Design a binder for this molecule. Sequence first.
Ligand SMILES: O=c1ccn2c(n1)O[C@@H]1[C@H](O)[C@@H](CO)O[C@H]12
Ligand SMILES: O=c1ccn2c(n1)O[C@@H]1[C@H](O)[C@@H](CO)O[C@H]12
Lengths: 241, 243, 241, 242, 240, 251
Amino acid sequence: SDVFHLGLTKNDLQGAQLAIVPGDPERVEKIAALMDKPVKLASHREFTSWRAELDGKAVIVCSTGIGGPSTSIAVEELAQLGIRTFLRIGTTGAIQPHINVGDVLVTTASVRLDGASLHFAPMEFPAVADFACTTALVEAAKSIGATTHVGVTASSDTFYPGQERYDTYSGRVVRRFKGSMEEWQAMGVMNYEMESATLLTMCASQGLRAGMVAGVIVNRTMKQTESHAVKIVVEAARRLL
Amino acid sequence: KSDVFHLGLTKNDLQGAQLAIVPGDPERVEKIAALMDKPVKLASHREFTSWRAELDGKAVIVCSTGIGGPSTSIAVEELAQLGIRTFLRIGTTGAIQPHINVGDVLVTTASVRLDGASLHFAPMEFPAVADFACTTALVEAAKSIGATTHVGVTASSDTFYPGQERYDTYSGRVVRRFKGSMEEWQAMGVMNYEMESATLLTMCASQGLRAGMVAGVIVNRTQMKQTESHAVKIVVEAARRLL
Amino acid sequence: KSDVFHLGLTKNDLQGAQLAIVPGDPERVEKIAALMDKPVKLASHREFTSWRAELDGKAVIVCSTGIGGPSTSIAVEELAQLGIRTFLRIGTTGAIQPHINVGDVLVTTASVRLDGASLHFAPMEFPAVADFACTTALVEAAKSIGATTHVGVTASSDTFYPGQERYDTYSGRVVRRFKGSMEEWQAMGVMNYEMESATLLTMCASQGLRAGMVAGVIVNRTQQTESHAVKIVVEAARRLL
Amino acid sequence: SDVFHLGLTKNDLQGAQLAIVPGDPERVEKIAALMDKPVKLASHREFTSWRAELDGKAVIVCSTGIGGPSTSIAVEELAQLGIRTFLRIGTTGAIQPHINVGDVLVTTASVRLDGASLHFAPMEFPAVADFACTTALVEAAKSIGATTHVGVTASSDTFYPGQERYDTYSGRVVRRFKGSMEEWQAMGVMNYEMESATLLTMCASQGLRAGMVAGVIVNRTQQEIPNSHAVKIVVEAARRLL
Amino acid sequence: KSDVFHLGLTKNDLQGAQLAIVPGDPERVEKIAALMDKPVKLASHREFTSWRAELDGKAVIVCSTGIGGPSTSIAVEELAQLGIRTFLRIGTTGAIQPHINVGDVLVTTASVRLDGASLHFAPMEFPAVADFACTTALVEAAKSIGATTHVGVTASSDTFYPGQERYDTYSGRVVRRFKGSMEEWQAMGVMNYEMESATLLTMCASQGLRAGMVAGVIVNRTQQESHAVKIVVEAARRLL
Amino acid sequence: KSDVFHLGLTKNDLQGAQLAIVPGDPERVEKIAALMDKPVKLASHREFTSWRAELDGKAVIVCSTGIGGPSTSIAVEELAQLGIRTFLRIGTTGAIQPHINVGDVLVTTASVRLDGASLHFAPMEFPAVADFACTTALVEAAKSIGATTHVGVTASSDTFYPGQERYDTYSGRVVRRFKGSMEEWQAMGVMNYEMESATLLTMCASQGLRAGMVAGVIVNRTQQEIPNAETMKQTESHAVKIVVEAARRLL
Ligand SMILES: O=c1ccn2c(n1)O[C@@H]1[C@H](O)[C@@H](CO)O[C@H]12
Ligand SMILES: O=c1ccn2c(n1)O[C@@H]1[C@H](O)[C@@H](CO)O[C@H]12
């Protein structure tokens, strides 16, 4: 292995320059099986990687695990192997009343409620997606005729307090996040997730292209939906090779 | 009679306009409006000079913002109060990337928040991101003109001198925060420096207003008639796709 | 033709002036200059309109700064380059203290830095403090014409609306940082709100330049003026040559 | 399931109140095997959980995955399931020249170079470990004679720039972290890892007890990347905390 | 005269002392020293009153720090310059937990840094953590002496009033940052308020010096706005 | 009897005094009081020693604050509860500007907040500015006595060592924030370093209280030579006489 965590070598990628990065390692094979010649490459910790082919071009599918920290490792090591385009596909919960389950959300930029993004750029720097990737995702969503929302996403380092969930062990939410969801809602924020701030910041600050698409599973205010998101990320990827 | 505190305009004055092209200099407002139908002057107070024109039968506003986010925040706010929901920033800029040559066009996806006004609308964590439809229209319009375009991040500074790490000043000093900052932005891929986008993009993206920005490169510190016109044609053409 | 990038001025144009009165509105430059000897127009570029006059045989400059710290930082810097060492800001303002009435004169000793430009010259810990000689001249000048004067702190905001906690706006909302802020400033003794002093005072105090500010109260939120404020700033200038 | 991610019910715990939480899901079974009646419970995403018995008391072993975000989910849902004491067992990069690979490091408190800890307490709050847990870990290491070092640990949200590793795609480190390792080193910080700040903060600020121990796999004063004593210790320590 | 700027002490004055007990009140220095052998007054400048004493045949220093991290930072630094490597702070404190009673002894593992001096030694991310050996000696000493002991986090404030959300003041107002802070600390398990541990603990932990802290409860905020001493001495005994 | 928790004073003790001179060292209190009429010691608790005296027939308080903003905040707060509305801090300091000589007098208009207590009264954006009347009284008093005066900004640090970028210490290191800071403050025109003004000026300016600050330069961080053993003594008397003279104008 040429990289410490993934257990992958440059040869394993077979020239691949684009990678689809879901958070769950169990979703890796499912995405790869949607393309040609899917082949499992490795599995270490939360990182499960597969190689497939799209229109004769090698593409990688590698899980990131939950959170910016594990995500930063996968992105960094994939970049070291040659990947220059990263497309995250995920599941999410909207915070806008009009966003229904099954809807597709394409992130233009993210509210940085994480810590890893700061390890690549100061807070003043925008966690913005790559224009081409975002365009590819929006056009792919339209292609399959999905109800799509394009906008800002709040990317939190936590699933509970950071997303202002009170049904917890302590039921306490620290001052910083007390009342935050309503704030985000009034600011037009679409949803909450836990990896985009890190992904988008480390990519945009190092000349790497990154996009983000997610299917709405729940609304604070899967099968078929996740299927949609997955089809969309694969079709978008096809336009970025 | 005016509905707002600074622009000296009434909603009636806009005639249903919902989109405004917002250059910084009031002496460029008429030139921009002149490219459209029925260009009529509306008002001028301070650095806020406004004109109304028509694009494919739809009224459009061209209003200057002045220099800086503070001045820009007043114009955008009051225009929003008059009915404007889409803002297209047009300008000329330098560049901090070697591969960007004079005459190229820059379309900004998001900005580095090196201002103060943006924080009066959203915390620093919030992205000073451009609207997707506006950015798309600008990129498409630029492409139709065959212009060499660069799409990326811009650094929006509250100062023309230290915030852009200029040492050719009275003090010849640059505060710690900005010492060595230009090479950092360059390494992060930042395309250029300008002084109003962080405020514009942040206040719009956090208030349900659509915003985008396009600029013509007139100078490159690492190394303007025609360049300005192209940018202007692009912003007007983009507005056409956003009406 | 020009020794500076924006003002359109040369050192010759100043004729040795070391003092500049800096109102925000270009429309007030001529009026202020009119109170002195041999007033003459110099230049006008963007929001920067300058005039030169004479007081007691010494050349004086009156130059507008426009609205906000960004344009103000450009005017101050370029005037400093031309030889200006003392800056006196004159303006009209809206008080936030119940007992500061319209017609009253405010002399700022220091400002609350709710701007962004000041930070491009000194870290937040540094005081946006006015120079003592300037403050003294303004106070004494105000006394000479019998104005009801208030000497103290001013809140300097990068915005006219949210930063001054105004809700009569399009969104009708004020970001967390500023929600409930006016009441706090009031309880802290802050006299008023304006938008240029934090930048002016911080950049001058941290670069060996002298600066002060006086304003006439023309309105009060907790419920001829301009001519007197102008008289005061010109009278104060005389004492600083 | 009583929780959203772990796929467990309180019954699966069998009265367990202490959880040994490694980062690597492949280390869970290895840890459970050193105890009685080891039984696999579930495996979803990066959260692999096993149950074991120590001195006749049910004990849980659950992986957290890499980083504070993943860790905060595991800790929270395990807390909802009834766990009150957490003992993290991990691997780490030493930053002091005298620390050898294989040495066991017990963390008293962590430098919060993460983001999730801020979701439980402001930066002013110390990411301090529980005294009983730290005592048990030190006492357990003393009982098996392992080379042990007790002190502060720097817990980073990244493996690369936050730990000032330059052997990367960009080869650059943001201003905030340039020269940071030398600084921590001069301050006595023993090592780098990526979960303790979050773990210790969320536990100390919510009435939960937490201990932190890790084995050295690389010495940063020499290289950025390398070419069971800590485990024995974490298990022994748990025995003292039942 | 003196090898240091403020304390007015010479290295020879310490007679080899490597541990110092540091109370806040200079008036308690003599009393604490009186609990050991051969107590000799050394100096008295500002709020820095110091005595030397002997414990199990080893020289020990008792030096007041005055109130606050700034004053404390000077005492600690200059004592370190003279050879002290272990600092045990003993103080009075106000509990913010209802189960903690007046007369109870508190041992601090780490402190909430609500001060400014700690930032002059380490950024805010760094923990104001106590030394493990020192904390252990304090806990073990508490058992020996016999006292209702509580071991946990302490909030160290740069002020006695607003920073501890006290309203019995001239203005009667508390700045935004501290409005409602006490119940926040309380919900987080913080045991008490005091004003020197954040600075002491941080500057020692980040400079290779051992520090520990114990305090006696003299009031409970959930109600109103000698053990400890015997414990710090017995603890010093275990650390010589 | 005591109306306050630390000072051990009662409003009666003040005899109507509304102004207080606040030096840092409790041993200096008696010295400053000696420049006025009928000085009498009031109390002494911890680093808080207080005396009452008469100035032009009006009661005035002299009370030490101790070192740093924390103890200073207690003294100022409790003296305020007792009725004091004006505070004049007098100190001895080390300058950081080459042109400021030993023996010179410094009057602080505002301070760089390198402390922590000031934040317990106002957020960092708020200026640690001195009251205009007090500053005017100090400047005019310096002129009456006839000293070489400098009027400007002061860096108020929570530490005597790293915060003032001193390397002659046990660890010999200075944390990142203060590394190269003295040079930055010098270029910004900061006159000196001291340890109580940020707290004192901020807590007073944000609570309707008047505060002034004057100090005598006993040493210069940029010069080689160091004042005999009478570094303070003569220079200290200079500043002391100036703060008393200034007080007379604020009664
Ligand atoms: O409330 C929700 C619902 C779903 N997600 C979320 N918040 O952020 C989560 C991570 O991206 C990932 C971790 O479960 O799933 C995203
Ligand atoms: O330098 C090091 C060495 C080891 N670890 C670390 N930093 O944090 C890492 C993750 O928890 C996990 C995967 O790297 O191992 C921990």
